[PDB]
Amino acid sequence: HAVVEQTEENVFLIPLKHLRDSQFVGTLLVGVPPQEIHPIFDTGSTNLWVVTTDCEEESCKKVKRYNPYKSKTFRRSFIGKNLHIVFGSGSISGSIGKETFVLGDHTVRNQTFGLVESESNNIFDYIDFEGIVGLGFPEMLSAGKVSFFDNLLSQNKNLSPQFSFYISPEDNTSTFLVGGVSKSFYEGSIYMLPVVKEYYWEVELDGIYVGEKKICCEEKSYAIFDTGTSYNTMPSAQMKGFFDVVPSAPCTEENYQEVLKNYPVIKYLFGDLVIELLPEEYMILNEESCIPAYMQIDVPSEKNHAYLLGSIAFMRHYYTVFVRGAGGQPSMVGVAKARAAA
Amino acid sequence: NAHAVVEQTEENVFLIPLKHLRDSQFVGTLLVGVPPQEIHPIFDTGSTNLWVVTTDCEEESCKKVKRYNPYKSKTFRRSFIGKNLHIVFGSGSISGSIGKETFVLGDHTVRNQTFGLVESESNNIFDYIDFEGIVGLGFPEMLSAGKVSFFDNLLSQNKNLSPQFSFYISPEDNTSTFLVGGVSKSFYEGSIYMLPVVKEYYWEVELDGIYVGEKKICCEEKSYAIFDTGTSYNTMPSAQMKGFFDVVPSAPCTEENYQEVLKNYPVIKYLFGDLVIELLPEEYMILNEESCIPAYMQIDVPSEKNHAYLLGSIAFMRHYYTVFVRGAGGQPSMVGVAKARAAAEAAQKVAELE
Numbered sequence: 001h002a003v004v005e006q007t008e009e010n011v012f013l014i015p016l017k018h019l020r021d022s023q024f025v026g027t028l029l030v031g032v033p034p035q036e037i038h039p040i041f042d043t044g045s046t047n048l049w050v051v052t053t054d055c056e057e058e059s060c061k062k063v064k065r066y067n068p069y070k071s072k073t074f075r076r077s078f079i080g081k082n083l084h085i086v087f088g089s090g091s092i093s094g095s096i097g098k099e100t101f102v103l104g105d106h107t108v109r110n111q112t113f114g115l116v117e118s119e120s121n122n123i124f125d126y127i128d129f130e131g132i133v134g135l136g137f138p139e140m141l142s143a144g145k146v147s148f149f150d151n152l153l154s155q156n157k158n159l160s161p162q163f164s165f166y167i168s169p170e171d172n173t174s175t176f177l178v179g180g181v182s183k184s185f186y187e188g189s190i191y192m193l194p195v196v197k198e199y200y201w202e203v204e205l206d207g208i209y210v211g212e213k214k215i216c217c218e219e220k221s222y223a224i225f226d227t228g229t230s231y232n233t234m235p236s237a238q239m240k241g242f243f244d245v246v247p248s249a250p251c252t253e254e255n256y257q258e259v260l261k262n263y264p265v266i267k268y269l270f271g272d273l274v275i276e277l278l279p280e281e282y283m284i285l286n287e288e289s290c291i292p293a294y295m296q297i298d299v300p301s302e303k304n305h306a307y308l309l310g311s312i313a314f315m316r317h318y319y320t321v322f323v324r325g326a327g328g329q330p331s332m333v334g335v336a337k338a339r340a341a342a
Numbered sequence: 343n344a345h346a347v348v349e350q351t352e353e354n355v356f357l358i359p360l361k362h363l364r365d366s367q368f369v370g371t372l373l374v375g376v377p378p379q380e381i382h383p384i385f386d387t388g389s390t391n392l393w394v395v396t397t398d399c400e401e402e403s404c405k406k407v408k409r410y411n412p413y414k415s416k417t418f419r420r421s422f423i424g425k426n427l428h429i430v431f432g433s434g435s436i437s438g439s440i441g442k443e444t445f446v447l448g449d450h451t452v453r454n455q456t457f458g459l460v461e462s463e464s465n466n467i468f469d470y471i472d473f474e475g476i477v478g479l480g481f482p483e484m485l486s487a488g489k490v491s492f493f494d495n496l497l498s499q500n501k502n503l504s505p506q507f508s509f510y511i512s513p514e515d516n517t518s519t520f521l522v523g524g525v526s527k528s529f530y531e532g533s534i535y536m537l538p539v540v541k542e543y544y545w546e547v548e549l550d551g552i553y554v555g556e557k558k559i560c561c562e563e564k565s566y567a568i569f570d571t572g573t574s575y576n577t578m579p580s581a582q583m584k585g586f587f588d589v590v591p592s593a594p595c596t597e598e599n600y601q602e603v604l605k606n607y608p609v610i611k612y613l614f615g616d617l618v619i620e621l622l623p624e625e626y627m628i629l630n631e632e633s634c635i636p637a638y639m640q641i642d643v644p645s646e647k648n649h650a651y652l653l654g655s656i657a658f659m660r661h662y663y664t665v666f667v668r669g670a671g672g673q674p675s676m677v678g679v680a681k682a683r684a685a686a687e688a689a690q691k692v693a694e695l696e
């Protein structure tokens with residue numbers, strides 16, 4: 001229903017390195033003179049977060065912090081109001097400010113963002129976290145008047161409102177696409193899925209199957225495309241049964257091939273359209289053990305009826321396009337077979 | 343499922359400048375025969391017959407234009423058994439004979455092209471325009487005569503062109519363009535949304551409702567939308583039209599006063615599935631002899647049972663870039679719509695869909 005951009009001069013590439021801490025980090029230029037940070041790109045949140053020298057905690061000091069006092073464009077915003085975000089694997093606290101950003105070759109001015117000052121209620125002890133580039137919708141902004149992406153587009157009238165994700169951890173060629181897609185990262189056709197609610201990248205979901213067993217959907221369910229979690233998710237209610245059909249297993253570098261030759265195929269249904277995940281696609285080796293790359297998550301608004309597709313269990317196999325709609329224009333998530341390496 | 347916009351060489355999309363004449367006509371250039379005789383036709387998505395005005399019509403309204411003299415063309419060919427051709431529409435009628443001739447459109451040549459030679463123009467509106475011909479861009483089923491549409495035939499003989507064309511309408515800055523074989527990113531911004539063609543006669547797509555402000559004008563029954571470059575106005579069925587003008591009145595306006603007079607008019611919302619198209623008062627109103635007048639007119643499409651609404655060149659295409667993609671077999675033809683880029687000047691680089 002939408003036309004994805006593909007002209008090789010209007011689509012810009014943001015290489016994403018997959019760190020050993022399970023992070024897909026790009027490059028972002030903060031302030032003037034530019035200070036370089038390596039944030040993650042997140043379709044499950046829209047706040048833009050930067051780690052700053054105001055945080056002298058052990059996990060902050062281990063990274064290249066952004067020094068706002070050396071930047072000549074920094075502006076403290078809502079002076080005297082803190083901002084606290086708590087999720088499943090940690091918490092993030094900080095102050096609000098405005099700064100100039102550079103993403104690839106595009107500049108953004110007067111950009112609201114959060115300065116990380118605390119990470120204390122943790123996973124930031126097991127990762128080198130430097131920031132988050134939020135790619136959800138503006139309604140999800142914990143603070144600020146404009147999403148970083150909407151504002152980037154607002155100031156770059158030549159970009160189409162699209163971005164896509166190519167996930168290739170094997171050869172570390174994962175790329176973030178700004179302004180469209182590329183024949184290099186997918187094959188076959190792109191199938192468009194409408195965004196039902198412009199909060200997360202949320203689309204209708206018609207069922208889930210593990211082999212012949214139907215896991216879903218007895219109720220109106222949804223799917224959320226979240227680059228911030230490497231795992232696929234399932235509600236608490238549904239989770240005890242998933243692992244019940246997808247068990248762990250002993251595996252080795254030379255044994256994984258055989259162990260998984262009996263596992264079921266996971267089929268996600270989006271109307272008449274069926275997406276398949278194979279055992280070697282949804283399983284992973286974790287200390288001589290094959291373990292379903294899945295995780296339990298209850299999305300509050302969705303009444304524990306939302307299922308998430310992560311970077312490793314899904315996007316690594318399916319190229320994903322995100323089409324941001326304007327007033328009256330619906331937003332879409334595009335899914336295509338990822339062109340796999342090696 | 344999806345279409346993509348791939349770049350293409352600047353010669354597989356050729357641009358046809360369209361001048362907006364004072365008679366409300368968007369006319370391009372067409373070369374007929376050998377030696378070339380120049381005509382200035384209109385390009386119409388609401389018919390597919392190719393019409394040329396000829397020296398065979400000595401009526402008062404024909405002699406005012408540069409008629410095509412087929413007896414001077416060495417490529418013109420009447421068929422031994424002739425076919426007469428009579429077309430009657432809302433603002434006049436057109437009569438003529440059928441013939442075959444060679445055409446050049448945008449430095450691309452088409453041979454064996456069936457076309458109608460205008461011989462009569464008497465019902466009349468041809469008294470209000472300098473009419474020289476029509477390039478029909480509808481589907482072949484609408485051909486009054488011929489085995490091959492001029493567009494289908496042009497592509498058939500030029501394998502470098504994709505079966506697409508688009509329309510950029512900007513009469514103010516006289517940069518209106520007709521594109522054959524693709525699109526140009528210089529003419530739109532944002533994304534393009536495709537709408538499937540339900541019936542390959544007109545360029546007709548499903549329509550789910552129309553709103554003037556809060557008032558729902560339609561649709562209690564399955565209605566449709568037709569993208570018709572042959573009318574500068576948007577149209578509406580009789581049933582729905584009497585109520586439109588009742589809520590969208592005219593008003594006295596001047597070049598500097600329209601801004602304020604129109605700042606309270608309602609917004610028209612066209613609904614195409616998940617897609618909502620809005621027209622603002624300054625976009626669907628026009629200055630016509632010191633009067634702001636909704637650029638709308640009544641039209642009943644016979645086939646659609648008076649349930650079709652038409653989108654013209656001035657009330658719609660001026661604000662919404664439109665791509666027309668003709669589909670094959672299992673793949674339907676589609677109309678693509680995008681927000682027109684008003685600061686566009688030329689067509690730097692071009693591209694096609696899928």
Ligand SMILES: CCC1(CC)CC(=O)N([C@H]2c3cc(C(=O)N[C@@H]4c5ccccc5C[C@H]4O)ccc3O[C@@]2(C)COC)C(=N)N1
Pocket residue numbers: 022023024040042043044045085087088089123127129132226227228229230297308
């Ligand atoms: C602050 C916005 C967040 C986090 C980015 C909040 C959040 O909780 N998530 C999801 C999520 C992530 C984790 C997790 O530890 N991720 C790891 C992580 C964490 C921080 C920094 C880098 C990394 C690398 C990555 O591996 C655990 C549970 C979890 O739950 C999701 C599905 C929330 O539901 C919608 C988001 N998408 N955005």
Ligand SMILES: CCC1(CC)CC(=O)N([C@H]2c3cc(C(=O)N[C@@H]4c5ccccc5C[C@H]4O)ccc3O[C@@]2(C)COC)C(=N)N1
Pocket residue numbers: 366367368384386387388389429431432433467471473476570571572573574577641643652
């Ligand atoms: C023969 C093909 C036609 C005519 C081009 C037949 C036709 O009737 N229409 C539509 C249409 C147009 C007019 C009209 O006078 N247009 C003016 C005109 C006329 C002749 C030459 C130049 C110009 C400049 C333009 O302003 C009036 C009613 C009307 O009704 C439409 C909606 C039919 O319904 C689908 C077409 N699309 N093409």
Ligand SMILES: *[C@@H]1O[C@H](CO)[C@@H](O[C@@H]2O[C@H](CO)[C@@H](O)[C@H](O)[C@H]2NC(C)=O)[C@H](O)[C@H]1NC(C)=O
Pocket residue numbers: 453454499
């Ligand atoms: C226009 O029509 C004529 C006849 O319908 C075409 O001429 C034929 O061309 C083919 C191709 O070589 C020959 O095999 C036939 O013998 C020709 N028949 C004739 C000349 O009577 C002509 O090619 C057409 N023009 C085109 C296709 O551009």
Ligand SMILES: *[C@@H]1O[C@H](CO)[C@@H](O)[C@H](O)[C@H]1NC(C)=O
Pocket residue numbers: 110145
């Ligand atoms: C910068 O953004 C804020 C956000 O509300 C806005 O109020 C302000 O006007 C912007 N700057 C200028 C110069 O307008």
